[PDB]
Amino acid sequence: VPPYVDDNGQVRITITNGLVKTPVYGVPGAGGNSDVQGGYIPENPNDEVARKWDKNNLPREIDVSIDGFKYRVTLNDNGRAIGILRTGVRPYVGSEKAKAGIMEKINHKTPEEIYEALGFNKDESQRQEKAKQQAEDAWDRLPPNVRKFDVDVEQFHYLVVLDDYGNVLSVTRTGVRPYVGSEKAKAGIMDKVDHKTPEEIYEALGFNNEEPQRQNQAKKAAYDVFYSFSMNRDRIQSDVLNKAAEVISDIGNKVGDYLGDAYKSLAREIADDVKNFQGKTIRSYDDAMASLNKVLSNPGFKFNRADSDALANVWRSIDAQDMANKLGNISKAFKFADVVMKVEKVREKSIEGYETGNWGPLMLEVESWVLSGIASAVALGVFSATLGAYALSLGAPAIAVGIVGILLAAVVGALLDDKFADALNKEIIKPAH
Ligand code: NA
């Protein structure tokens, strides 16, 4: 038609002129009649083709067929089988037809009694169990539920796999582009005269020169299609952005008590912006550093060497595994499950920060999450929540609490918006004069 999702349960994407197309969003259209590459991602979430895939418009009743028996299976809101209806029987084979004829016309048995008497119900439980499982798989193959993307970039293909929060689990090249012009002869010669493998031929013709860039494009395109489903944006909102916002809020109460309602106010601007983070991407390392340096270069913001390396001590005593399991309590998103590795690095780079005053390594580490394919929202979510967990365990400086309060607002706000650095300098730092 093309089909929305392929046989293999993958969603197709093609990038032409930097623009993304997918059968999920065609458009037959008008005619037309229909583009094989698919339709563009809709700009408006209440366009027909957008709304079509909203959670509330996905089928709850799935028709499946098992050994000739036809079932309609009802699924709940999470696509789990909570109901079944037997909608049709298997065809005779006997001689059952001649027998059924006698049962019907002579003995006046209703049709369903004919089936009982013929053993059609012997394996009824087993069939229903299969039917439900098959319906549950159909639900997982529905576009907003798809996590496997086949992406065509300049005619190379990449399988991109994502988790339920849009993080990239893998990207793998599955096809290369056809040979063009004099590449055909070159290739035929490399194969038959030189005995090169196809992989070595692709290398020699330059096919790998832009492999990193094309893979980034495919990661992005797959994410953008994944992000285009409201079902998916909403899960990220509940499980990631809302949670991170709540954590930033708690800190605002903790630190606000030792630092005034100017910080309470600021903490609430940050939390609000985290909550409304939407389709934004975290600011660059270079930009984030410049905003952080604006705070760190304030003369009114110096903490004692004793204060700093005691704050480092607290980090040193923190068990990374323990902290990660506590993050695990927030939502499914906080158990990749990496996730200890991200905590352990936040631990060791904060130590570096407190000991040396160099916060670069800490900010670089968050950049590297996103370069790895971790979604901006999740990076921000894990960074916030890890820093938060430290801030709430303190215990027991207790004006060094104000120091971490400034620092957290500084590193977190640096990822969101330069106005937070300004806010820190303008209204909470209080220097001379
Ligand atoms: Na292709």
Ordered by start, the domain boundaries in the chain are 1-52, 53-147, 148-228, 229-433
Q: Using the structure block, give the residue that is written with the tokens 């489903």.
A: 229
What is the Cβ-side half-sphere exposure of residue 356, based on CA atoms within 13 angstroms? 11
Let me know if the fold of 53-147 is the same as that of 229-433: no
Task: Compute, in angstroms, the gap from residue 152 CA to the centroid of ligand 1.
Answer: 6
Q: Are strands 61-66 and 19-22 parallel, antiparallel or unpaired?
A: unpaired
Which DSSP helix (H) or strand (E) runs through 66?
Answer: strand 61-66
d(CA 356, CA 352): 6
Contact 424, 259 (CB under 8 A): no
The burial of 125, by beta-carbon neighbours within 10 Å (0-12 exposed, 13-18 middle, 19 or more buried), is given as: exposed
Task: Compute, in angstroms, the gap from residue 32 CA to the centroid of ligand 1.
Answer: 21
Task: Compute, in angstroms, the gap from residue 356 CA to the centroid of ligand 1.
Answer: 52
> Domain 148-228 falls in which CATH fold?
Ybab; Chain: A; (3.30.1310)
Closest Cα to residue 216, out of 373, 335, 347, 326? Answer: 373
Task: Compute, in angstroms, the gap from residue 228 CA to the centroid of ligand 1.
Answer: 23
Q: What Å distances lie between residue 82 and 17, 69, 73, 294, CA to CA?
A: 46, 19, 8, 57
Q: Using the structure block, give the residue that is written with the tokens 């065809």.
A: 91
SS3 of residue 105 by DSSP: helix
d(CA 154, CA 177): 7
Strand partners, 52: none
d(CA 165, CA 222): 12
SS3 of residue 234 by DSSP: helix
CATH code for the part of the protein at 1-52: 4.10.80.380
Contact partners, residue 281, CB within 8 Å, separation at least 6: 370, 376
Task: Compute, in angstroms, the gap from residue 376 CA to the centroid of ligand 1.
Answer: 30
Task: Compute, in angstroms, the gap from residue 287 CA to the centroid of ligand 1.
Answer: 38
Task: Compute, in angstroms, the gap from residue 197 CA to the centroid of ligand 1.
Answer: 21
Contact partners, residue 140, CB within 8 Å, separation at least 6: 9, 79, 146
Strand partners, 73: 62, 84
SS3 of residue 333 by DSSP: helix
Tokens encoding 406: 């400034």
Q: What Å distances lie between residue 217 and 39, 162, 182, 223, CA to CA?
A: 18, 14, 27, 10
Task: Compute, in angstroms, the gap from residue 157 CA to the centroid of ligand 1.
Answer: 7
Q: Are strands 39-40 and 148-153 parallel, antiparallel or unpaired?
A: unpaired
Closest Cα to residue 295, out of 413, 432, 433, 386? Answer: 413
Tokens encoding 123: 């394996």
Q: What is the DSSP letter of 177?
A: P
d(CA 66, CA 221): 37
Task: Compute, in angstroms, the gap from residue 43 CA to the centroid of ligand 1.
Answer: 25
> Domain 53-147 falls in which CATH fold?
Ybab; Chain: A; (3.30.1310)
Task: Compute, in angstroms, the gap from residue 155 CA to the centroid of ligand 1.
Answer: 4
Task: Compute, in angstroms, the gap from residue 360 CA to the centroid of ligand 1.
Answer: 42
Contact 347, 366 (CB under 8 A): no
d(CA 380, CA 376): 6
Tokens encoding 186: 């070159």
Strand partners, 159: 150, 172
Task: Compute, in angstroms, the gap from residue 50 CA to the centroid of ligand 1.
Answer: 25
Task: Compute, in angstroms, the gap from residue 154 CA to the centroid of ligand 1.
Answer: 8
Q: What is the DSSP letter of 90?
A: P
Task: Compute, in angstroms, the gap from residue 285 CA to the centroid of ligand 1.
Answer: 36
Task: Compute, in angstroms, the gap from residue 177 CA to the centroid of ligand 1.
Answer: 7
Q: Using the structure block, give the residue that is written with the tokens 């996590």.
A: 147
CATH of 229-433, one of 1.10.645.10, 2.60.40.420, 1.20.200.10, 1.10.490.30: 1.10.490.30
Give the E-state strand segments of 67-198 in sequence order. Answer: 69-75, 81-88, 148-153, 156-162, 168-175
Write down the H helix ranges in 237-304: 242-259, 261-275, 285-296
Task: Compute, in angstroms, the gap from residue 184 CA to the centroid of ligand 1.
Answer: 18
The torsion angles phi and psi of 383, rounded to 5 degrees, stand at: -60, -55
Strand partners, 74: 61, 83
Which experiment gave this structure?
Answer: X-ray
Contact 277, 376 (CB under 8 A): yes
d(CA 191, CA 198): 8
Task: Compute, in angstroms, the gap from residue 22 CA to the centroid of ligand 1.
Answer: 13
Contact 389, 326 (CB under 8 A): yes
